[PDB]
Design an enzyme around this catalytic site. Structure first.
Site, PDB file in Angstrom:
ATOM      1  N   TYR A  38       0.860  -1.165   0.000  1.00  0.00           N
ATOM      2  CA  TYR A  38       0.000   0.000   0.000  1.00  0.00           C
ATOM      3  C   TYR A  38       0.897   1.215   0.000  1.00  0.00           C
ATOM      4  O   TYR A  38       1.971   1.058   0.660  1.00  0.00           O
ATOM      5  CB  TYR A  38      -0.809  -0.132   1.325  1.00  0.00           C
ATOM      6  CG  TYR A  38      -1.914  -1.183   1.137  1.00  0.00           C
ATOM      7  CD1 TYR A  38      -2.957  -1.000   0.264  1.00  0.00           C
ATOM      8  CD2 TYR A  38      -1.880  -2.339   1.931  1.00  0.00           C
ATOM      9  CE1 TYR A  38      -3.978  -1.966   0.166  1.00  0.00           C
ATOM     10  CE2 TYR A  38      -2.840  -3.333   1.825  1.00  0.00           C
ATOM     11  CZ  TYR A  38      -3.900  -3.117   0.926  1.00  0.00           C
ATOM     12  OH  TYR A  38      -4.859  -4.068   0.832  1.00  0.00           O
ATOM     13  N   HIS A  40      -1.552   1.560  -3.533  1.00  0.00           N
ATOM     14  CA  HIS A  40      -1.441   0.955  -4.870  1.00  0.00           C
ATOM     15  C   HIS A  40      -2.675   1.401  -5.620  1.00  0.00           C
ATOM     16  O   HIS A  40      -3.631   1.803  -4.929  1.00  0.00           O
ATOM     17  CB  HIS A  40      -1.188  -0.530  -4.969  1.00  0.00           C
ATOM     18  CG  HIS A  40      -2.109  -1.473  -4.258  1.00  0.00           C
ATOM     19  ND1 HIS A  40      -1.800  -2.162  -3.108  1.00  0.00           N
ATOM     20  CD2 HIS A  40      -3.388  -1.819  -4.582  1.00  0.00           C
ATOM     21  CE1 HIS A  40      -2.826  -2.896  -2.757  1.00  0.00           C
ATOM     22  NE2 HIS A  40      -3.782  -2.715  -3.628  1.00  0.00           N
ATOM     23  N   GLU A  58      -5.461   3.428  -3.427  1.00  0.00           N
ATOM     24  CA  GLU A  58      -6.070   2.936  -2.204  1.00  0.00           C
ATOM     25  C   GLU A  58      -5.047   2.814  -1.089  1.00  0.00           C
ATOM     26  O   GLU A  58      -3.930   2.379  -1.341  1.00  0.00           O
ATOM     27  CB  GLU A  58      -6.703   1.585  -2.276  1.00  0.00           C
ATOM     28  CG  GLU A  58      -6.149   0.268  -2.672  1.00  0.00           C
ATOM     29  CD  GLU A  58      -7.159  -0.864  -2.439  1.00  0.00           C
ATOM     30  OE1 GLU A  58      -7.499  -1.215  -1.325  1.00  0.00           O
ATOM     31  OE2 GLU A  58      -7.564  -1.318  -3.529  1.00  0.00           O
ATOM     32  N   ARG A  77     -10.833   1.470   3.414  1.00  0.00           N
ATOM     33  CA  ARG A  77      -9.865   2.209   2.649  1.00  0.00           C
ATOM     34  C   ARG A  77     -10.209   3.637   2.323  1.00  0.00           C
ATOM     35  O   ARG A  77     -11.384   3.947   2.031  1.00  0.00           O
ATOM     36  CB  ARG A  77      -9.748   1.571   1.204  1.00  0.00           C
ATOM     37  CG  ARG A  77      -9.388   0.139   1.122  1.00  0.00           C
ATOM     38  CD  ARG A  77      -8.058  -0.260   1.703  1.00  0.00           C
ATOM     39  NE  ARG A  77      -7.828  -1.705   1.515  1.00  0.00           N
ATOM     40  CZ  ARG A  77      -7.988  -2.609   2.477  1.00  0.00           C
ATOM     41  NH1 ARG A  77      -8.138  -2.244   3.748  1.00  0.00           N
ATOM     42  NH2 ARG A  77      -7.929  -3.902   2.211  1.00  0.00           N
ATOM     43  N   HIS A  92     -14.813  -3.247   2.401  1.00  0.00           N
ATOM     44  CA  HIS A  92     -15.186  -4.624   2.042  1.00  0.00           C
ATOM     45  C   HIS A  92     -16.365  -5.137   2.879  1.00  0.00           C
ATOM     46  O   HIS A  92     -16.950  -6.200   2.562  1.00  0.00           O
ATOM     47  CB  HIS A  92     -14.041  -5.559   2.302  1.00  0.00           C
ATOM     48  CG  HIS A  92     -12.906  -5.476   1.331  1.00  0.00           C
ATOM     49  ND1 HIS A  92     -13.106  -5.628  -0.016  1.00  0.00           N
ATOM     50  CD2 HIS A  92     -11.595  -5.407   1.533  1.00  0.00           C
ATOM     51  CE1 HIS A  92     -11.941  -5.601  -0.637  1.00  0.00           C
ATOM     52  NE2 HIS A  92     -11.040  -5.496   0.298  1.00  0.00           N
ATOM     53  N   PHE A 100     -15.915  -3.978  -2.963  1.00  0.00           N
ATOM     54  CA  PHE A 100     -16.087  -2.827  -2.125  1.00  0.00           C
ATOM     55  C   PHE A 100     -17.490  -2.251  -2.330  1.00  0.00           C
ATOM     56  O   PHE A 100     -18.153  -2.399  -3.323  1.00  0.00           O
ATOM     57  CB  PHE A 100     -15.143  -1.664  -2.400  1.00  0.00           C
ATOM     58  CG  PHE A 100     -13.730  -1.954  -2.022  1.00  0.00           C
ATOM     59  CD1 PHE A 100     -13.286  -1.828  -0.716  1.00  0.00           C
ATOM     60  CD2 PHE A 100     -12.887  -2.429  -3.054  1.00  0.00           C
ATOM     61  CE1 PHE A 100     -11.940  -2.083  -0.432  1.00  0.00           C
ATOM     62  CE2 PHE A 100     -11.551  -2.709  -2.785  1.00  0.00           C
ATOM     63  CZ  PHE A 100     -11.121  -2.519  -1.469  1.00  0.00           C
TER      64      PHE A 100
HETATM   65  N1  LIG Z   1     -12.349  -4.930  -5.745  1.00  0.00           N
HETATM   66  C1  LIG Z   1     -11.342  -4.186  -6.253  1.00  0.00           C
HETATM   67  N2  LIG Z   1     -10.058  -4.498  -5.988  1.00  0.00           N
HETATM   68  C2  LIG Z   1      -9.200  -3.663  -6.640  1.00  0.00           C
HETATM   69  C3  LIG Z   1      -9.445  -2.624  -7.449  1.00  0.00           C
HETATM   70  N3  LIG Z   1      -8.269  -2.021  -7.918  1.00  0.00           N
HETATM   71  C4  LIG Z   1      -7.340  -2.738  -7.354  1.00  0.00           C
HETATM   72  N4  LIG Z   1      -7.831  -3.781  -6.585  1.00  0.00           N
HETATM   73  C5  LIG Z   1      -7.051  -4.649  -5.670  1.00  0.00           C
HETATM   74  O1  LIG Z   1      -7.430  -6.013  -5.856  1.00  0.00           O
HETATM   75  C6  LIG Z   1      -7.410  -6.745  -4.615  1.00  0.00           C
HETATM   76  C7  LIG Z   1      -8.557  -7.750  -4.555  1.00  0.00           C
HETATM   77  O2  LIG Z   1      -9.758  -7.050  -3.926  1.00  0.00           O
HETATM   78  C8  LIG Z   1      -7.593  -5.607  -3.557  1.00  0.00           C
HETATM   79  O3  LIG Z   1      -6.953  -5.756  -2.379  1.00  0.00           O
HETATM   80  P1  LIG Z   1      -7.809  -5.327  -1.040  1.00  0.00           P
HETATM   81  O4  LIG Z   1      -9.156  -4.872  -1.473  1.00  0.00           O
HETATM   82  O5  LIG Z   1      -7.905  -6.502  -0.123  1.00  0.00           O
HETATM   83  O6  LIG Z   1      -7.074  -4.236  -0.386  1.00  0.00           O
HETATM   84  C9  LIG Z   1      -7.386  -4.210  -4.272  1.00  0.00           C
HETATM   85  O7  LIG Z   1      -6.293  -3.497  -3.771  1.00  0.00           O
HETATM   86  C10 LIG Z   1     -10.783  -2.283  -7.747  1.00  0.00           C
HETATM   87  O8  LIG Z   1     -11.178  -1.405  -8.461  1.00  0.00           O
HETATM   88  N5  LIG Z   1     -11.702  -3.140  -7.077  1.00  0.00           N
END
Ligand SMILES: Nc1nc2c(ncn2[C@@H]2O[C@H](CO)[C@@H](OP(=O)(O)O)[C@H]2O)c(=O)[nH]1
Ligand SMILES: [Ca+2]
Length: 104
Positions: A38, A40, A58, A77, A92, A100
């Site tokens: 992070y 990212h 994020e 986030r 989440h 999300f």
């Molecule tokens: N659901 C989602 N995940 C994203 C997106 N862009 C990047 N990702 C990454 O993909 C991973 C799978 O959800 C995420 O980790 P995290 O949500 O657990 O932090 C997130 O950082 C997006 O637009 N939506």
């Protein structure tokens, strides 16, 4: 009252602005934190109606009130752009799988 409610977590604007600043700083410096590295990019697969432009990034915000420094990032986030503009607060919590939903 909460400025942002992510599931059961309650955030004020000040919690948000501190998280964001930590996040943007790493970003500006080209550094990352945690196993998930992070901050990212946030692709916005969800299609949220953000009012600032991409690219989006994020960064975890913690219910503990501490600044993310590694380990589990929890479910919440902050989403900021290249201009250090707040795009929104997401979680989440209440979303299926790894999707999300927005904090209210
Ligand atoms: N659901 C989602 N995940 C994203 C997106 N862009 C990047 N990702 C990454 O993909 C991973 C799978 O959800 C995420 O980790 P995290 O949500 O657990 O932090 C997130 O950082 C997006 O637009 N939506
Ligand atoms: Ca707080």
């Amino acid at each position: 009252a909460c400025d942002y409610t992510c599931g059961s977590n309650c955030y004020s604007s000040s919690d948000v602005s501190t998280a964001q600043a930590a996040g943007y700083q790493l970003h500006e410096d080209g550094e990352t934190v945690g196993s998930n590295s992070y901050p990212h990019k946030y692709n916005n697969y969800e299609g949220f109606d953000f009012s600032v432009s991409s690219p989006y990034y994020e960064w975890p915000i913690l219910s503990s009130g501490d600044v993310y420094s590694g380990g589990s990032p929890g479910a919440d986030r902050v989403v900021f752009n290249e201009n250090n503009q707040l795009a929104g607060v997401i979680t989440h919590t209440g979303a299926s799988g790894n999707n999300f939903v927005e904090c209210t």
